[PDB]
Amino acid sequence: SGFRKMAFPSGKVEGCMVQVTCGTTTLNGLWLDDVVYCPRHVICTSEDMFNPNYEDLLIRKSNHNFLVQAGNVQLRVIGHSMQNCVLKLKVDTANPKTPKYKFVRIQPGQTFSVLACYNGSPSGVYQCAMRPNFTIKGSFLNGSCGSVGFNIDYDCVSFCYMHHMELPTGVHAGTDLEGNFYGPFVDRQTAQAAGTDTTITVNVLAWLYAAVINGDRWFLNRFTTTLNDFNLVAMKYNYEPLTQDHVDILGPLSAQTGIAVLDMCASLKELLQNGMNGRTILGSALLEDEFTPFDVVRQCSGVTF
Amino acid sequence: SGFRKMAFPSGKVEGCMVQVTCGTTTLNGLWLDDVVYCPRHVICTSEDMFNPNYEDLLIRKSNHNFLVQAGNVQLRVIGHSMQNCVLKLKVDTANPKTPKYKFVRIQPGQTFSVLACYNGSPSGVYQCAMRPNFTIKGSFLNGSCGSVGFNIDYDCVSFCYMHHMELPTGVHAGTDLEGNFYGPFVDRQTAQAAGTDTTITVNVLAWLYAAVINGDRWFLNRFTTTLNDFNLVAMKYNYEPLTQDHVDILGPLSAQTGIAVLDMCASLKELLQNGMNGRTILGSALLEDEFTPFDVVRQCSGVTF
Numbered sequence: 001s002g003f004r005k006m007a008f009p010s011g012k013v014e015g016c017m018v019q020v021t022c023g024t025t026t027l028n029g030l031w032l033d034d035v036v037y038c039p040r041h042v043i044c045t046s047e048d049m050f051n052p053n054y055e056d057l058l059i060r061k062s063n064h065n066f067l068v069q070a071g072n073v074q075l076r077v078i079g080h081s082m083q084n085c086v087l088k089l090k091v092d093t094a095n096p097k098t099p100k101y102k103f104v105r106i107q108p109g110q111t112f113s114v115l116a117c118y119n120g121s122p123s124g125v126y127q128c129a130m131r132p133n134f135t136i137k138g139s140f141l142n143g144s145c146g147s148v149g150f151n152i153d154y155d156c157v158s159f160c161y162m163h164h165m166e167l168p169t170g171v172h173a174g175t176d177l178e179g180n181f182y183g184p185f186v187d188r189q190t191a192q193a194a195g196t197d198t199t200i201t202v203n204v205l206a207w208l209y210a211a212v213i214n215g216d217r218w219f220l221n222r223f224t225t226t227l228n229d230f231n232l233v234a235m236k237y238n239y240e241p242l243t244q245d246h247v248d249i250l251g252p253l254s255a256q257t258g259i260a261v262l263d264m265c266a267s268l269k270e271l272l273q274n275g276m277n278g279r280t281i282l283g284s285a286l287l288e289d290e291f292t293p294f295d296v297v298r299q300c301s302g303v304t305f
Numbered sequence: 306s307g308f309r310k311m312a313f314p315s316g317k318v319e320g321c322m323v324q325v326t327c328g329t330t331t332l333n334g335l336w337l338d339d340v341v342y343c344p345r346h347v348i349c350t351s352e353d354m355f356n357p358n359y360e361d362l363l364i365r366k367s368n369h370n371f372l373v374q375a376g377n378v379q380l381r382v383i384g385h386s387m388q389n390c391v392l393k394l395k396v397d398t399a400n401p402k403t404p405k406y407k408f409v410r411i412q413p414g415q416t417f418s419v420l421a422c423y424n425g426s427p428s429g430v431y432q433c434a435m436r437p438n439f440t441i442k443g444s445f446l447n448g449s450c451g452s453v454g455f456n457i458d459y460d461c462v463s464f465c466y467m468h469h470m471e472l473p474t475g476v477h478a479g480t481d482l483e484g485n486f487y488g489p490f491v492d493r494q495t496a497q498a499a500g501t502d503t504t505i506t507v508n509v510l511a512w513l514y515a516a517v518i519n520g521d522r523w524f525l526n527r528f529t530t531t532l533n534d535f536n537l538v539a540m541k542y543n544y545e546p547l548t549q550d551h552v553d554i555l556g557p558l559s560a561q562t563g564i565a566v567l568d569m570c571a572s573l574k575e576l577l578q579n580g581m582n583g584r585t586i587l588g589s590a591l592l593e594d595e596f597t598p599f600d601v602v603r604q605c606s607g608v609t610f
């Protein structure tokens with residue numbers, strides 16, 4: 001028993017982390033096969049990052065201008081190109097530790113593990129969730145760029161995020177592994193603001209199922225409700241509208257616990273209108289919305305990789 | 306910026322995880338050099354675990370009775386012995402992925418990363434803290450035994466915990482890598498209860514420093530206090546007595562933030578007597594005591610491994 005913010009094992013991702021240095025800027029790169037993916041502002045100086053012309057800054061750069069280091073071995077760059085906000089550095093040696101992988105673009109509310117790195121070396125791993133405002137809350141410092149977000153399915157590592165910048169409210173923004181930003185953000189040091197964030201409703205319900213699985217049951221009531229009646233109350237508390245797709249995704253958890261999804265919605269409805277009354281759930285005095293239904297099943301059933 | 310429950314990169318530990326099967330019981334083992342460490346109740350049946358005689362159960366076992374699998378390769382066992390509550394299975398092949406490591410016995414209040422495994426395969430990683438009652442809150446299911454807790458210093462992996470059992474209150478107990486249990490617990494299915502747990506005071510203060518580092522400052526006041534005056538108030542809220550050693554350990558954080566330790570104690574004193582007044586700290590409405598001062602510095606300064 002027990003429930004924890006559990007990240008995926010980062011071993012497969014650690015074997016692909018490299019150091020990328022262009023001039024005086026040093027960032028992290030993702031070494032898959034014979035290509036190194038890294039944020040495109042590695043070619044920027046401190047003054048370039050205000051109004052950067054990445055196309056122009058890349059013309060004045062040759063292959064030898066990119067210093068890629070895998071541990072104590074320097075990777076010879078034999079090609080380079082730019083795909084949106086990421087550079088593709090072609091090296092003459094393929095990474096032997098390249099795991100089976102895929103490039104995916106996750107949806108808001110979905111979670112992933114972040115392997116925070118500096119100078120091509122991993123510092124730690126934690127769990128994150130793509131907020132509905134297309135930002136992620138993170139733990140990133142300068143030099144963390146190129147660190148990636150990921151999910152693991154059996155032997156396949158699905159890369160879904162690459163860090164790029166931090167917003168004034170302390171949250172972080174980045175792109176997918178094709179350089180496409182999550183949200184209306186751009187990689188330049190100007191005034192940028194994240195939109196109003198909302199609470200991921202389907203993840204809150206999944207977190208309530210984990211609580212029931214682990215013995216936390218005081219919030220359960222004999223009432224039921226309709227999807228329309230629940231969304232009318234949740235919308236006033238800045239909660240995500242619960243769709244039929246979310247109910248179908250919560251099916252596996254509802255079947256294992258024996259609690260209908262609309263029953264759990266009736267419990268969440270009471271929790272939003274009356275609070276927690278000095279009580280906690282899984283040791284937390286606040287509702288938790290960064291646990292997908294799969295995160296609950298994977299943790300409570302022991303899915304391995 | 307940002308602060309998160311961050312675990313160490315588990316890559317070095319994943320390369321040592323193996324599957325250990327004795328009869329019908331399958332657990333996890335730690336493959337370091339040519340020795341596999343695993344919990345000693347792998348030789349137990351379901352009925353043996355009530356009043357087990359591990360010495361007697363081991364006499365009736367030969368080397369070939371232990372089935373060790375590293376991925377798709379079976380490791381031939383050429384020796385076996387028991388050290389307290391752990392078995393040392395000597396194999397004929399040394400693990401090439403053996404990292405620089407050490408066996409340490411951590412103190413209450415210190416943290417580590419748990420690589421939860423099943424059938425020798427990693428399921429996830431999370432951060433844990435050795436509670437003052439010598440239990441750890443965890444996320445373990447049946448088959449999780451042999452999973453280990455660890456800390457990383459540069460290139461050295463310090464193994465400090467091995468999972469064994471779960472207590473009735475949902476918490477978990479285990480041993481060090483020499484088979485010595487943490488606390489007065491034994492590896493048998495009988496009535497066992499964890500003592501009254503307390504809040505790790507020095508870790509709460511370290512968590513308050515991380516909050517100040519990340520902009521959370523509403524709880525700061527102009528008051529100061531003495532170590533004697535703070536411990537008199539904290540003792541009534543079931544907090545750990547703050548010692549001079551704890552103040553010296555918080556030195557690095559106090560110097561970086563420019564806030565004296567006794568000043569932070571004056572803030573914590575007010576927080577314990579008056580609550581949080583509907584406010585949060587680092588998004589949390591409860592005080593956090595599983596972040597050592599080193600965990601704060603390592604995360605907020607980007608220490609890599």
Ligand SMILES: CC(C)(C)[C@H](NC(=O)C(F)(F)F)C(=O)N1C[C@H]2[C@@H]([C@H]1C(=O)N[C@H](C=N)CC1CCNC1=O)C2(C)C
Pocket residue numbers: 041044049140141142143144145164165166167168172186187188189190191192306
């Ligand atoms: C935070 C700062 C106000 C400086 C700025 N923010 C905005 O410009 C915004 F407001 F538009 F977001 C910003 O992050 N950057 C300016 C510039 C890059 C980037 C950057 O330094 N990346 C770091 C690389 N290691 C990761 C860091 C550092 C701090 N926190 C992180 O996460 C680019 C957008 C090209």
Ligand SMILES: CC(C)(C)[C@H](NC(=O)C(F)(F)F)C(=O)N1C[C@H]2[C@@H]([C@H]1C(=O)N[C@H](C=N)CC1CCNC1=O)C2(C)C
Pocket residue numbers: 001346349354445446447448449450469470471472473477491492493494495496497
């Ligand atoms: C939880 C149970 C009431 C069954 C019992 N607890 C107590 O006997 C106590 F109350 F004394 F703690 C207990 O855990 N065990 C009985 C027996 C071992 C062990 C065990 O099953 N280990 C599992 C191995 N994969 C890890 C698990 C399983 C569930 N939760 C975990 O963490 C031994 C102590 C030899």
Ligand SMILES: [Cl-]
Pocket residue numbers: 004005310431432
């Ligand atoms: Cl956690």
Ligand SMILES: [Cl-]
Pocket residue numbers: 142143144
């Ligand atoms: Cl840097």
Ligand SMILES: [Cl-]
Pocket residue numbers: 212217
């Ligand atoms: Cl129930």
Ligand SMILES: [Cl-]
Pocket residue numbers: none
């Ligand atoms: Cl009541």
Ligand SMILES: [Cl-]
Pocket residue numbers: 005126127309310
């Ligand atoms: Cl977290």
Ligand SMILES: [Cl-]
Pocket residue numbers: 447448449
């Ligand atoms: Cl099992």
Ligand SMILES: [Cl-]
Pocket residue numbers: 517522
């Ligand atoms: Cl301040």
Ligand SMILES: [Cl-]
Pocket residue numbers: none
């Ligand atoms: Cl006020």
Ligand code: NA
Pocket residue numbers: 001002003214215282475
């Ligand atoms: Na629990």
Ligand code: NA
Pocket residue numbers: none
């Ligand atoms: Na200009």
Ligand code: NA
Pocket residue numbers: 100101102
């Ligand atoms: Na591929």
Ligand code: NA
Pocket residue numbers: 168
């Ligand atoms: Na600003």
Ligand code: NA
Pocket residue numbers: 212257258259
């Ligand atoms: Na149930």
Ligand code: NA
Pocket residue numbers: 170306307308519520587
């Ligand atoms: Na913050």
